[model samples]
Target: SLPHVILTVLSTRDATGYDITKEFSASIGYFWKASHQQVYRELNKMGEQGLVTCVLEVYSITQAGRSALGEWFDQPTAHPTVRDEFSAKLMACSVQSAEPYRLQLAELVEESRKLVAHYQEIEAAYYANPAVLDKQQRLERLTLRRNLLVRQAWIQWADEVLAELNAMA
Candidate 1:
């Protein structure tokens, strides 16, 4: 998994280990995450395996790496895993004070709004061209749409909870 992630990033841009770590947070962090130590380890290993080459401190994907990525992409997609700390906190609300939960809900509402806004930026950029997306780009756009919908839904749920909290006042 780590090797594939390195390969995927290299496929797009030539980057040093540090650059790749930062790029992971901005781009691939949507679906996956990796620590700098893990990234450096995998990068060194992949370089030894002839999947990536480093020139002038920048790592670039080789033909073998692209072949590997293509082969991996040919496999069936896996279901996405979900982990939401805010949802868990909501479920456990009865065991805590109402004020704290209300505050958390308020924070979450703001956070969801920010996420929606970020995705909206991506939406605008993608649709600016409006009709030239290849198959994979279309699928990636669907992922962005999913994120947008989920963030909006979270905002709505938070608003409902806030209403209930206020009603109890």
Candidate 2:
């Protein structure tokens, strides 16, 4: 659980265990509930388990660590869902062009449309359906189900972006 949180922190940048402990301030931080000792244990386990790599005292989330966070997020527990879509989305909000922004966002719309169609195809095909699975596995499906909602909404948003800018273009 905490191991999941630490991966998010490292996704920001490398930090010492102390820096990880100090990371207790943010909207995301509100979701965290941790202890210093557990921080040590989890990070120790994470390093030894290859979820993270350690230098002197600093640690970085590795590919497995990051991918593991996605798996953990699918589990039947409550926590903030995702990160960095903010920074990705945040900047272009402040300025725009019927020119530059339109070109980039057309690509965004295309990519998002492709992902949405792909997820739906898998769903409709019942890609791995064999009923009677564990409830935990069901949450994995729901996590993806929730993502389609946001992804589609964001797709619409990109369309809106293209629409607004095209008036000027």
Candidate 3:
């Protein structure tokens, strides 16, 4: 699971052990729990297994890992283990209940969008703060960039799901 998750994540971009831990802590923490020590250990193991190619300076997915990740993201394959569960929850709303279930689902989607908006707003205020000391700016900038990626993904997913619901209507 760790290998697969790490591959899936690194398939997007190359990262160091610390970078992976930080990104996981920020983005994937909502769904999965991974520690920095675990990340470093698995990174070593992955390099040994030829699942990832690692240099002292940085690490990137090997060709084998890239093939695996591509297959992971690809559809129309006969593999049975894909656990794309987001759609499952959405589809379940139809047969589940009428009153609170549907309402709560919609409410939750809205709340997710609001979270994205709030993050964006906070990022703006942080950047706009003249009182922010120069020493803190780099850290804040990195956090803001990471949060913006997260917020964009969250908002895009929320919009796509709501659009699906609207299309059904």
Candidate 4:
């Protein structure tokens, strides 16, 4: 899992462990999170597999790593696994007062809004010179668009949930 994340980052640019950790916190951390310890551990494993090479704490993917990443991209997308703890709590709210749930949902809605705003900022940057982008930049923009869509969906879903809770209040 960590290797996959590392490879994706390395695909963008060569970075040190510290730089990769920062990248995860800023970007992929939203969906795929890893601790610093775990990142270091996997760096070692990936090194052994010839998937990546490290020099002076900097890590970069090797030919084998790029090949693996190509294979991964060709693989069929898997179904999303639902593991939302908030959703579990919402289910329990049916038999109890929705007070706490309302607050929690509101907080999540605000968080989603922030994410949407952030995505929009990124989208604007990408669109500023859309015609000047290369293949890799275009691909990165596509992933950014996906995040925008997901965040928008989250806001819509949270709004619906809030409305339902209100009606029951």
Local distance difference test values of all predictions, in order: 0.79, 0.71, 0.70, 0.82
Candidate 1: regions farther than 4 A off? 11-42, 55-58, 62-71, 74-77, 80-84, 132-140
- RMSD for all candidates, in order, please: 4.1, 12.7, 9.1, 3.2
TM-score of 2: 0.45
Clashing pairs in 3: none
Tens-digit lDDT string for candidate 2 (96-164): 433555576788789989978877775555424537545544544565566568889999877766676
On TM-score, the candidate that comes out on top is 4
The C-alpha TM-scores of every prediction are 0.65, 0.45, 0.43, 0.75
Which one is best on lDDT?
4
List runs of model 4 lying over 4 Å from the truth.
8-32, 35-37, 55-60, 63-67, 82-87
lDDT of 2 at 116: 88
| Number of colliding residue pairs in model 1 | 0
Q: How close is candidate 1 to the true structure, as a TM-score?
A: 0.65
lDDT score at residue 36, model 2, on the 0-100 scale: 77
lDDT of 4 by residue, 10-106 (tens): 9878898889888677656655778888888888899999999977737889999999988888889887798988778889998977898889889
lDDT of 1 at 38: 81
**Cα deviation of 35, candidate 1, in Å:** 7.4
Question: Which lDDT tens digits does candidate 3 get at residues 45-140?
Answer: 888888888677467898988887677667464656867566676777677543454465567667767766766676576655646646445455
* Lowest lDDT 10-residue stretch of candidate 2: 24-33
